[PDB]
Amino acid sequence: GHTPEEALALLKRGAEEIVPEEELLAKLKEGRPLTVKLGADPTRPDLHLGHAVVLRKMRQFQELGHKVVLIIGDFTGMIGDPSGRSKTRPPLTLEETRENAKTYVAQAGKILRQEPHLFELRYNSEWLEGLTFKEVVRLTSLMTVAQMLEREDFKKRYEAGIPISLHELLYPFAQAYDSVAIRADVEMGGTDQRFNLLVGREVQRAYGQSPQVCFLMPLLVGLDGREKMSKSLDNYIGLTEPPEAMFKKLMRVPDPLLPSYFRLLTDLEEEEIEALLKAGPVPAHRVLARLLTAAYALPQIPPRIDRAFYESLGYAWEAFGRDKEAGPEEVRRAEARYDEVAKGGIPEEIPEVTIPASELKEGRIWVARLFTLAGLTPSNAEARRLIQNRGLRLDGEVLTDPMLQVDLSRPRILQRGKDRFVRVRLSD
Amino acid sequence: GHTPEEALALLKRGAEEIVPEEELLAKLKEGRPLTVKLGADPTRPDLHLGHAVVLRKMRQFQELGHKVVLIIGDFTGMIGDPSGRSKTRPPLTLEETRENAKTYVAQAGKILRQEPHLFELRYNSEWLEGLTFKEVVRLTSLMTVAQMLEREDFKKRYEAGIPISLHELLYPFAQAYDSVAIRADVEMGGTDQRFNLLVGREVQRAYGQSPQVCFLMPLLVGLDGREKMSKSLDNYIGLTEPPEAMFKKLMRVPDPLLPSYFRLLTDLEEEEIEALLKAGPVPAHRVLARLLTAAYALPQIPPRIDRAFYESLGYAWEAFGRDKEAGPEEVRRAEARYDEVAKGGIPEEIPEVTIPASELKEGRIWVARLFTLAGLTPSNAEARRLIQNRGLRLDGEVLTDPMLQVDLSRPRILQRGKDRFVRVRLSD
RNA sequence: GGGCAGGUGCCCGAGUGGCCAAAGGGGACGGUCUGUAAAACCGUUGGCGUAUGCCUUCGCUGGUUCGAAUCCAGCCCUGCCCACC
RNA sequence: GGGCAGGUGCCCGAGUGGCCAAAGGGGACGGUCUGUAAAACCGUUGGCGUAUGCCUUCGCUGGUUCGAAUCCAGCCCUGCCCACC
Numbered sequence A, B: 001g002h003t004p005e006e007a008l009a010l011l012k013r014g015a016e017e018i019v020p021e022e023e024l025l026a027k028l029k030e031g032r033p034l035t036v037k038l039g040a041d042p043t044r045p046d047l048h049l050g051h052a053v054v055l056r057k058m059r060q061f062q063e064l065g066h067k068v069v070l071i072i073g074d075f076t077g078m079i080g081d082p083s084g085r086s087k088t089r090p091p092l093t094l095e096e097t098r099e100n101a102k103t104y105v106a107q108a109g110k111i112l113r114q115e116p117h118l119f120e121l122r123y124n125s126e127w128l129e130g131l132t133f134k135e136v137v138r139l140t141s142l143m144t145v146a147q148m149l150e151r152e153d154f155k156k157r158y159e160a161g162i163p164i165s166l167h168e169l170l171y172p173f174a175q176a177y178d179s180v181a182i183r184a185d186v187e188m189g190g191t192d193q194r195f196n197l198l199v200g201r202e203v204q205r206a207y208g209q210s211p212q213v214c215f216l217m218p219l220l221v222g223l224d225g226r227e228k229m230s231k232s233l234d235n236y237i238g239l240t241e242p243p244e245a246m247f248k249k250l251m252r253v254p255d256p257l258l259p260s261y262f263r264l265l266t267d268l269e270e271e272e273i274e275a276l277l278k279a280g281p282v283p284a285h286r287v288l289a290r291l292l293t294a295a296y297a298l299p300q301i302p303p304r305i306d307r308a309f310y311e312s313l314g315y316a317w318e319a320f321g322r323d324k325e326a327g328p329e330e331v332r333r334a335e336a337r338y339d340e341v342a343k344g345g346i347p348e349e350i351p352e353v354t355i356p357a358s359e360l361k362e363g364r365i366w367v368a369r370l371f372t373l374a375g376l377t378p379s380n381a382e383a384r385r386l387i388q389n390r391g392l393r394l395d396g397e398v399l400t401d402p403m404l405q406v407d408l409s410r411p412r413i414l415q416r417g418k419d420r421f422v423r424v425r426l427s428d
Numbered sequence C, D: 001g002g003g004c005a006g007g008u009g010c011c012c013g014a015g016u017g018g019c020c021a022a023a024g025g026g027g028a029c030g031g032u033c034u035g036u037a038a039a040a041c042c043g044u045u046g047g048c049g050u051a052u053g054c055c056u057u058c059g060c061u062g063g064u065u066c067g068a069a070u071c072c073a074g075c076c077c078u079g080c081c082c083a084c085c
Ligand SMILES: Nc1ncnc2c1ncn2[C@@H]1O[C@H](COP(=O)(O)O)[C@@H](O)[C@H]1O
Pocket: A039, A040, A041, A049, A050, A051, A053, A054, A188, A189, A190, A191, A192, A193, A217, A218, A219, A220, A221, A228, A229, A230
């Protein structure tokens, strides 16, 4: 067990801000399970490692005995959180969010404990649909226009002449009322959620509730190296991606992001992180990719993604990435495939596509149209352009003839770029 | 009967703006009773001649066969229309507005026809209370922040650092939704209502309705000569004030307001108004005061407050105010009292106040405390100050001794200023 | 409700009758080099099976012109400015 | 959530330890003059029945001081600036 001070110190690790920090300490001394809120608007399906930053911290709360309330923003997602936005969000239907919501519920359990005393799922439509005009008037009366416009995206858009739809100013009051509805002790979020979390405190005060602690985590940067990991930016690693693909993507995280990936996605000690960085960028990537590929290949990540877990998998810490043959089978194969492809090899397991003979012309298929039929190129023009840039291979050889007519009398291995492969064959 | 063109020309008289004017002409050619909307938030009891400006125009619509829908803003009045406001309005309870609402319903009929085919009363709580959060989101999505802040009071307050409560930006959508609820063809208002009326058009378009014509009347200036007549400014003449008081107040309208009072409150022709102004300010006041004192002494004003009506009362147009002995008894007495008081006389009918002998000190009452007991002064200090300024009279003589101890062995006539009188006497 | 400007490619954004699948910057994509990284460098960034060609393309719908992303008109939406004060 | 400034009389607003029931402007109120108007001019704009006095008074609650509208602290609310990007 932990004392309240020990609890707070553990929870602080990796956090950007706990505010008011003294209030979390005081709540931790109450000797009761705290209600820890996280909302997520399912505007697109699937969770990624950026979501894992806040969810892993919530798992830490659960391992300390506190209760997570995961709010599916089926109602709020219809609106669109303008936080950080450069322009107004497109609306979605309640049915749209609830289809995406199914993935969130299924995937959240890959990180969160699911025992009821530690976890409860809510849909904010449960209470937001019945909120009446009079109540909305009284809620919005709690803040002024000048106060609302302080939020960075409102200030910048207004000063630049970029439209702000008035309904965007109602969204924070929905999120904040959610905290009243579930009597939140703590609200989790990335740093981008800071303003809405603070409105939560204001609305709770107005409803006579203790104002929640706002618990802010730093944002994981995406694979591009600059922007926050997000679905819209197509720079993300999904929690349910096959180990093969997760391992490859983690190996390609830009080197300057390694410390934050270790701090936000693992529990390694600071000296352990420095030790991996001493070994060098590639060894450090191998350990990161092994830890997380293994953890997310499990049905649920362990309570600690630490050195002990690493060795649990069969790896040796003092090998610093050299022991490639160790580990869970799924991870070992993923790393083996990564290295085989890196050296110019073709993996043995590659997707298969059968081409109907009705596509043949003079008994063959023009190479450009063949790659579009295989799903590797969006258009024949693009296939031609990739050939001009030496981006396509046929049975391992770089294509130099954009007019090549390909013989499919036997299966052929098509390759686009570094590691997209398809074997094509014919069928009547 | 009137043609649509004749109808529009009549309705234009006195109006500041009909917009789109061509749309009113087209509605008038439809050959059906148009729904003519007026909302009024009963934030204080009683209607005044400023309200009469818009209500008389509505009466004109009714006399042309169109249907008034008078909306009591029992719900909106709880919020507070920020239009023209220098600061945020104080909220009221639904019970508060509905007590004030009783006066509005009773007094509106002094101007409006009350036959159902010409008149229907609604309370906007009828439909606004059931408006749901989702619907409010969709309503507010119809306008942006920059669009909302164009309204003069929002722009000036925001640029000056004067707070605007966010709920003030919801009010126009309530007023506008009211137009959807009753399918308004026309919305009436003073010029101060222009922005909210135009939002009405936008919301009607979004609900697939023909957008209402916005019918704007100029604001009647109050007795102070500068500000719009309003209860808050204490510069108004109430529709139900006794003829005695209405006549006196109309005689004291500043001379530069006479043309607008004739144009907005009577139907006299422009050449008739000039003819009265030629007679001089006082004659012109006598005719104005007679016309309106008579009209509002009736249970309902006539369809035309014109020269024919004037002569109907027994006055002679070519006497230009000299025939003081003519007219309804109530008006003749009011004018007689006005002139008697002007020449320093005391009227025969004056309020009576009985003072209990328990107020006596050495068998008398200090003059200052006597005026406070009579209701003429708010405090003895103020009575003393008024004596120093020669503002109080006792039995017609100007009081010069602020220490006077008044003998009440017989009734005494107290006077404050020009025309506030009270007769005081004793009782055990 | 009135005026003016604007909406363009993955994003921002230039166009300023033809030189436009479209400047410049960013991004993304391919390659060299490697470490399936970065940087640097070169290239690509509507579609079409015979191409000196065909189809589609700058908010929507039309119009003038041999030719419109560009000019005109109606309409939608936005910003600024009016109106309201 | 952090900082700074602010809330004063009917309104705006000055105060800058005592000279404060409180500058200045507006408004309102009384009077002269009249037209029960305006303008101009003079005056008034916390309360109290013996006044060289008593009571209350500058967002709320306390505090320092002989004395606080003024200085200090906690709290409420606002504006600007942070945070968020
Ligand atoms: N890349 C990220 N790093 C850390 N937290 C994130 C990231 N992306 C989303 N979140 C958090 O996950 C929640 C849902 O975010 P979103 O998916 O953007 O609606 C919010 O609390 C976010 O701050």
